[PDB]
Amino acid sequence: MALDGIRMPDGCYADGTWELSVHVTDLNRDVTLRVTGEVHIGGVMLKLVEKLDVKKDWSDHALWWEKKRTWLLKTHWTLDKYGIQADAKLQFTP
Amino acid sequence: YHERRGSLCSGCQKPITGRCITAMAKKFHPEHFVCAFCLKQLNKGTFKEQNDKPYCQNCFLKLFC
Ligand SMILES: [Zn+2]
Ligand SMILES: [Zn+2]
């Protein structure tokens, strides 16, 4: 709806889409993927690569959470599950 | 001028000397028919796909499971 307990700019935004930041360490760039708190990690590496479109290092691709120094390989859980969001900047490296 | 042949990779039409994948009866360079995650190797026995993009199951499953 919109209420959600807040209002709309924050109680809606438009659809609850927040692009997750991705600091590519293998490129040193920073990309953002328009996602929601329901996309599986394996869902992010897919899109980010889709934008690439090249026989580049695709297997050497995996997201890590420096706020946790982890390796986001839990395709079962999601962002919300762990608590990730736009305030969480991930990276795209092996 | 040896004689060791193999199997032309349909689409490439060049003998496949080593490993050879088979399709609708066509052959394929085990490489030119890899998974699009880790483009190094795929197998018609474990070749998964989505949106037309090849994938190893372990690769595709990792995406949508
Ligand atoms: Zn070929
Ligand atoms: Zn693969």
Structural summary, described in words:
The complex is a heterodimer of chains A (94) and B (65). Chain A starts with 17 loop residues before the first strand and ends with a strand. Chain A contains two helices and four strands, in the order ββαβαβ. In chain A, 17% of the residues lie in helices and 18% in strands. Chain A has helices spanning 41-52, 79-82, and strands spanning 18-23, 30-35, 63-64, 90-92. Chain A has one domain (1-94): Ubiquitin-like (UB roll) (Roll). Chain A is α+β, with helices and mostly antiparallel strands. Chain B is α+β, with helices and mostly antiparallel strands and 65 residues long. Chain B has one domain (1-65): Cysteine Rich Protein (Ribbon), CATH 2.10.110.10. Chain B contains one helix and four strands. Chain B has one helix at residues 57-63, and strands spanning 21-22, 27-28, 47-50, 53-56. In chain B, the strands form two sheets. Chain B has a two-stranded antiparallel ribbon with strand order 1-2. In chain B, strands 3-4 form a two-stranded antiparallel ribbon. The interface between A and B is small, with 10 and 9 residues. The structure holds zinc ion (2 copies). Chain B: It comes from Homo sapiens (Human). Chain B: Residues 8-65 form the LIM zinc-binding domain. Chain B: Belongs to the paxillin family. Chain B: Cytoskeletal protein involved in actin-membrane attachment at sites of cell adhesion to the extracellular matrix (focal adhesion). Recruits other proteins such as TRIM15 to focal adhesion.
